[PDB]
Design a protein around this ligand. Structure first.
Ligand SMILES: CCCCCCCCCCCCCCCCCC(=O)OC[C@H](COP(=O)([O-])OCC(O)COP(=O)([O-])OC[C@@H](COC(=O)CCCCCCCCCCCCCCCCC)OC(=O)CCCCCCCCCCCCCCCCC)OC(=O)CCCCCCCCCCCCCCCCC
Ligand SMILES: CCCCCCCCCCCCCCCCCC(=O)OC[C@H](COP(=O)([O-])OCC(O)COP(=O)([O-])OC[C@@H](COC(=O)CCCCCCCCCCCCCCCCC)OC(=O)CCCCCCCCCCCCCCCCC)OC(=O)CCCCCCCCCCCCCCCCC
Ligand SMILES: CC(C)=CCC/C(C)=C/CC/C(C)=C/CC/C(C)=C/CC/C(C)=C/CC/C(C)=C/CC/C(C)=C/CC/C(C)=C/CC/C(C)=C/CC1=C(C)C(=O)c2ccccc2C1=O
Ligand SMILES: CC(C)=CCC/C(C)=C\CC/C(C)=C/CC/C(C)=C/CC/C(C)=C/CC/C(C)=C/CC/C(C)=C/CC/C(C)=C/CC/C(C)=C\CC1=C(C)C(=O)c2ccccc2C1=O
Ligand SMILES: CCCCCCCCCCCCCCCC(=O)O[C@H](COC(=O)CCCCCCC[C@@H](C)CCCCCCCCC)COP(=O)(O)O[C@H]1[C@H](O)[C@H](O)[C@H](O)[C@@H](O)[C@@H]1O
Ligand SMILES: CCCCCCCCCCCCCCCC(=O)O[C@H](COC(=O)CCCCCCC[C@@H](C)CCCCCCCCC)COP(=O)(O)O[C@H]1[C@H](O)[C@H](O)[C@H](O)[C@@H](O)[C@@H]1O
Ligand SMILES: CCCCCCCCCCCCCCCC(=O)O[C@H](COC(=O)CCCCCCC[C@@H](C)CCCCCCCCC)COP(=O)(O)O[C@H]1[C@H](O)[C@H](O)[C@H](O)[C@@H](O)[C@@H]1O
Ligand code: HEC
Ligand code: FES
Lengths: 216, 109, 223, 160, 216, 53
């Protein structure tokens, strides 16, 4: 005798498809935790990255923001060795997460990477001083790299998980906030007070980088 | 075995030569291995401070250096020097000044 | 090198163009094309001597090399330039590396040998038989470069172990195990070859049993 | 590696191929699949006590039978079917048998020294994925193994 | 017979001293190391902390920045639930690491937490644009917490170990950096350019927090 | 637990006790200190083959 089933010359066959393994069911339900966080919203977790790109479609910076033990433990690294020039790029948090090359939410001039729906994306109940929307100057030297953090937690993961995706936008200015006080300095009109546009958020020239923080 | 001698009964403690500072306050660390044939001496009796061995019913007076006050045992249980390190965790402040298991020919010298 | 290439070409033209046709293309049904075989293949094969081959049979046997190290290098460089492929390892000076190929770990080398090499060769690198007139030869003659290049280029009916399949560290460990098993003295007496059951049974039947029967014939009386 | 490969071949395959009860004998010997965690302890019992005990009992029966059913002899001058021509146990037979025992154990010791047998250190630990080319049993089971090799791959496939 | 050695009535003893274990010479061939980084200096490693205190000794915040793969990852946790008020604060890197209550490196008024030997602690070879001497901002909401990151890498672990210990000093302003451009705004004297003191570093009122980055 | 503590007492202790050769007997029997990893195989052999024989 010979084995009943052999010798199927016909039906040449097909290349196997790329395997897409299904997740382990309740049986092997064990899986790695995606990150613990307060998550006072629909849920974001302790893991969230983003890529701040330029007007040419090339990545400039790569930010990371996520709650760890009730506070966002974030970190940003320059994705290219010559993204930022020898100076301080002023970071800020824009409520609008669209990191478009150039957009204008209101009726007016559309600045480069100006998709933000205002200045600094403050909290829902906070619209005065420079809340978590505001950010200071991060410096890139002749090496051209950016990595340094601060403590800006006017918002949390719940606040980040807002109605509209937010973004991190780096313009080409430092962080002063009307360093010239009214005692000595004067404005264009002679009033010793500061400018509302400068006070609400960091105003600079054309935006250098912009990246949606919606797990970009 | 780490035993906590009651503060009231701390005045009845008699210490061995070279083992006076072994105890950390009211904490005394004595080897569980019985000095006679090496069974653990786990049966600790408080309010009598007697470490009894179940294998052959030998009592060691924990208050005094753990010397046998009954049963086949004739040598005291080895006392571990103990203290607290940084963070307050209990650590051994050295090694037994004598071999700790049951006795044998090449011993006591 | 220019002169090395020229020497390799001159040796090739008067050694193998009859079966690895000029231009390194293979002669149909006499020899395979050497394009892509590389310098490691040439080194192993010619140094072991298999390549000055004077018969088409089940397997090309080993033999004394027909070329000295310099000519081996010339032929290897010629073949590498023509085809391009794996290169034999070399030490700091430039000579083919021998001691540098002895991997540090021998337990790992032995495990890899058993999983991959002993499959056909032996527990300890003695030879093994194959389907139709072929055979895995004993590894005790091979030097570390020869073992490494044998793995690097599957010579004949031997799986080709790329660097990706067996990282050079793993190949170095296997080389160390091969050399150690080959150069290690048999503990417990004369290891009768390396095969246990068959040489041991023959030695029983010939040494122990003839001794016992002869002693019995001495003690007893024929009748 | 060598002996475990031999076990995997013979004890497992042959046992598990037997038609009506093959798998049942395999699982009952190995306490389950081939690498069952009781095979070597069971073989150890069988090999140090059970089988050697039976061998000792049967050797006792054998020697007692030879002793009391007087040893047969070749035809010769004074040798008939109703007598035993030879030497008595005490003076000559006993001494020569003891001397032969001494010489046989001397041969065995000499060979244990001078000739290497079963270098298990060379033969790595058993792993199902590893194997050598030799893969032979001792010369006494070599005939069974040779039968396995030579028999011409005749397999029958009854209904399912 | 009784064992030779027993009984000690005299010499009551002493309380064992606190154990101070020694690093293993036998088990470890060398000395175990923690964070790994290039550390192009005398050596700082991938672990650097700091505690920014207040004028009265209270812990304003706790920062920590260290190099991991050539980019310094940082994070700051609020030391008190109400360290920062419901507004914005500007964080700047000061060359002088002395986080004193009030000091004045130059000849002039000693501002609170003004131990810095100048403005932003820029790189040794950089003294123009706002180099790494400027850090990210700290926006505090009604919650009063700080957690956020930027990309400021003009200096690295090598540059951190400078001649003098540096510090992070947070005042209570936003991040603008002369957001009023010369086209529209004007200075006190009529010039359209910005102020040198404002451009050098983030200038605001009295400093709120100050913490030495010398592994404080 | 019971049989092991019984072994520890009787075999190990009384073997180490013997004056001139006690520790040597203990090490020969257990192949080392008391919990030596050959004790139970040795006892198994002694108990199923040697002493029964
Ligand atoms: C392969 C290599 C070896 C494989 C097998 C080798 C066999 C050799 C045995 C030699 C024994 C012998 O000649 O002894 C006499 C001889 C003289 O003693 P003795 O006192 O005259 O013997 C008492 C009597 O004379 C009584 O003894 P006898 O002389 O009358 O008997 C002679 C012979 C008479 O029998 C034959 O003629 C048998 C011939 C067989 C030939 C087959 C080969 C064909 C090959 C062609 C195919 C290839 C392709 O009997 C045999 O020996 C039978 C052997 C058959 C095995 C054939 C295996 C194939 O013995 C010796 O001096 C040394 C013998 C040492 C051998 C020890 C093992 C003996 C165990 C069985 C023997 C049979 C019992 C006899 C006692
Ligand atoms: C184990 C393996 C290792 C080797 C052991 C096997 C050796 C067998 C050789 C047999 C030799 C033998 O039994 O000779 C004994 C032999 C007994 O037979 P016997 O004297 O000729 O009696 C008349 C015939 O037996 C009458 O018999 P029959 O010639 O008329 O033929 C009848 C025969 C029918 O033939 C048979 O069927 C015999 C075969 C028996 C089958 C299986 C039985 C053996 C199983 C052994 C299992 C061992 C495990 O039945 C038997 O005789 C069966 C006897 C069974 C004894 C087997 C011994 C083993 O004589 C002696 O007893 C002499 C030794 C005296 C001992 C005392 C010495 C001084 C006392 C000191 C004590 C303490 C001192 C402190 C102060
Ligand atoms: C299934 C089966 C048996 C198939 C056939 C395979 C087989 C046994 C073929 C024969 C082997 C031979 C004799 C090869 C030489 C070529 C050949 C056939 C020549 C013609 C034969 C012929 C008629 C010659 C004229 C007179 C004659 C009969 C001479 C025979 C010559 C020989 C080899 C005699 C002795 C027999 C012998 C050693 C046979 C090989 C068998 C074995 C199992 C050897 C065991 C053995 C081995 C294999 C070791 O490697 C080893 C290494 C280190 C120490 C010890 C040993 C050791 O003992
Ligand atoms: C590193 C290390 C451990 C090394 C050691 C290796 C090891 C583990 C073990 C081996 C070590 C040892 C102990 C080796 C020696 C073994 C041993 C006992 C050898 C004895 C041979 C010897 C020393 C002879 C000295 C010369 C001399 C004066 C001889 C005459 C006196 C003697 C010794 C007579 C002995 C007679 C003898 C063999 C009795 C065997 C008893 C038995 C089991 C059966 C008797 C018996 C026999 C022998 C038959 O032939 C027979 C045939 C037909 C029917 C029945 C019988 C029968 O019943
Ligand atoms: C009567 C009782 C006495 C028993 C004999 C005891 C002999 C004791 C010898 C001395 C102590 C042990 C030496 C152990 C050192 C040692 O092992 O010995 C080898 C040798 O080996 C050989 O060649 C064989 C040389 C020939 C002499 C021995 C022949 C004896 C046979 C005939 C005994 C059995 C009877 C069989 C009868 C056959 C007829 C049947 C009808 C030598 O090295 P080598 O030669 O290089 O081995 C190669 C590795 O190197 C290399 O890698 C490796 O790959 C291999 O190639 C390896 O061979
Ligand atoms: C130490 C242990 C000693 C043994 C003691 C224990 C032995 C107990 C054996 C009885 C237990 C029940 C048998 C189970 C297994 C069984 O045997 O298979 C039966 C087979 O009945 C048939 O139809 C066969 C007859 C039809 C073909 C005619 C063939 C004639 C042949 C036999 C002639 C050659 C004989 C030559 C002898 C050579 C000897 C060599 C030395 C059918 O299957 P089934 O009972 O439903 O079992 C299902 C599994 O088949 C299923 O794969 C699984 O999925 C489960 O569902 C299971 O329940
Ligand atoms: C299966 C195993 C069978 C046994 C076979 C193997 C036995 C070999 C035993 C011989 C090996 C050498 C002995 C080693 C050990 C030894 O025995 O100790 C010696 C002792 O000599 C003395 O002075 C003693 C005499 C003076 C006192 C007089 C006493 C009279 C007594 C004996 C009377 C009572 C007898 C009653 C019998 C009751 C029987 C009960 C049923 C002195 O010490 P030492 O040789 O320098 O060895 C150092 C270690 O002491 C050291 O602790 C260590 O640190 C190492 O340095 C080591 O080298
Ligand atoms: C059967 C599959 C096979 C396996 C797998 C295999 N070999 Fe081989 N090996 C052979 C064959 C067949 C030859 C002979 C090639 C020739 O002569 O052209 C050979 C040749 C060799 C040689 C040359 C020896 C000489 O003196 O010429 C060495 C050394 C060697 N093998 C070692 C190894 C090493 C190292 C491995 C790594 C696992 C390995 N073998 C795996 C079959 C194999
Ligand atoms: S075993 Fe403890 S007193 Fe005897």
């Amino acid at each position: 005798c010979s084995p009943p089933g052999e010798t199927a010359s016909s039906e040449p066959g097909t290349t196997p498809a790329i395997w897409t393994g299904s997740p382990s069911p309740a049986a092997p339900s064990g899986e790695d935790h995606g990150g613990g966080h307060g998550a006072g919203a629909a849920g974001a977790g302790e893991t969230l990255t983003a890529e701040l790109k330029t007007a040419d479609g090339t990545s400039v910076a790569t930010a990371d923001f996520q709650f760890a033990d009730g506070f966002a433990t974030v970190t940003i690294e320059t994705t290219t060795p010559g993204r930022l020039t020898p100076g301080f790029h002023g970071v800020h948090i824009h409520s609008v997460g669209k990191c478009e090359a150039n957009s204008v939410a209101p009726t007016g001039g559309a600045p480069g990477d100006f998709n933000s729906a205002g200045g600094h994306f403050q909290v829902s109940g906070h619209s005065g001083h420079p809340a978590s929307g505001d950010l200071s100057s991060l410096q890139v030297r002749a090496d051209g790299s950016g990595k340094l953090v601060t403590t800006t937690d006017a918002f949390t993961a719940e606040d980040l998980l807002d109605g509209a995706k937010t973004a991190i936008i780096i313009h080409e200015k430092a962080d002063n906030f009307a360093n010239i006080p009214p005692e000595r300095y004067q404005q264009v009109n002679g009033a010793p007070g500061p400018d509302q546009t400068t006070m609400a958020t960091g105003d600079a020239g054309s935006r250098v980088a912009c990246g949606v923080i919606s797990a970009g | 075995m780490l035993i906590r001698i009651k503060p009231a009964d701390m005045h009845r403690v008699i210490k061995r030569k070279g083992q006076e500072s072994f105890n950390f306050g009211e904490l005394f660390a004595y080897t569980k291995v019985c000095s006679h044939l090496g069974c653990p001496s786990s049966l600790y009796e408080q309010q009598t401070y007697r470490i009894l061995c179940p294998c052959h019913q030998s009592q060691f007076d924990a208050l005094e250096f753990a010397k046998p006050i009954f049963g086949p045992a004739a040598r005291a249980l080895a006392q571990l020097p103990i203290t607290i390190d940084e963070d307050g965790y209990l650590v051994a402040n050295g090694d037994f000044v004598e071999p700790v298991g049951p006795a044998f020919w090449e011993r006591k010298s | 090198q220019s002169a090395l290439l020229r020497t390799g070409k001159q040796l090739f033209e008067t050694s193998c163009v009859s079966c690895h046709g000029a231009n390194l293309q293979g002669v149909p049904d006499r020899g395979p094309s050497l394009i892509g075989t590389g310098e490691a293949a040439v080194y192993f094969q010619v140094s072991t001597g298999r390549m000055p081959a004077m018969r088409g049979e089940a397997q090309a046997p080993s033999k004394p090399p027909h070329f000295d190290e310099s000519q081996i290098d010339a032929l290897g460089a010629y073949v590498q330039a023509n085809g391009g492929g794996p290169t034999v390892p070399r030490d700091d000076h430039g000579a083919v590396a021998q001691e540098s190929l002895i991997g540090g770990d021998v337990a790992r080398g032995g495990d890899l040998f058993r999983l991959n090499c002993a499959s056909c060769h032996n527990f300890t690198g003695k030879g093994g038989a194959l389907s139709s007139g072929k055979y895995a030869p004993d590894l005790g003659d091979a030097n570390p470069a020869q073992i490494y290049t044998a793995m690097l280029t599957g010579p004949q009916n031997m799986p080709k172990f790329s660097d990706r399949q067996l990282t050079p560290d793993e190949k170095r460990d296997i080389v160390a195990y091969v050399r150690e098993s080959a150069e290690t003295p048999s503990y417990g007496g004369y290891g009768l070859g390396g095969f246990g059951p068959a040489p041991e049974g023959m030695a029983m039947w010939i040494i122990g049993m003839v001794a016992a029967i002869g002693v019995a014939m001495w003690i007893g009386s024929r009748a | 590696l060598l002996s475990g490969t031999g076990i995997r071949a013979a004890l497992s395959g042959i046992t598990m191929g037997i038609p009506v009860i093959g798998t049942w004998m395999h699982w009952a010997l190995f306490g389950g699949d081939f690498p069952g965690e009781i095979l070597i302890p069971r073989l150890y019992a069988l090999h140090i006590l059970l089988i050697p005990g039976i061998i000792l009992a049967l050797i006792g029966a054998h020697l007692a039978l030879v002793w009391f059913q007087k040893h047969t002899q070749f035809p010769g001058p004074g040798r008939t079917e109703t007598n035993v021509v030879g030497v008595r146990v005490m003076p000559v037979f006993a001494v020569k048998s003891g001397a032969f025992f001494a010489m046989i154990t001397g041969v065995l010791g000499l060979m244990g020294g001078l000739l290497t047998i079963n270098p298990i250190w060379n033969l790595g630990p058993y792993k199902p994925s590893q194997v050598s080319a030799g893969s032979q049993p001792d010369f006494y089971m070599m005939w069974t193994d040779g039968l396995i090799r030579l028999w011409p791959a005749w397999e029958f496939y009854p209904f399912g």
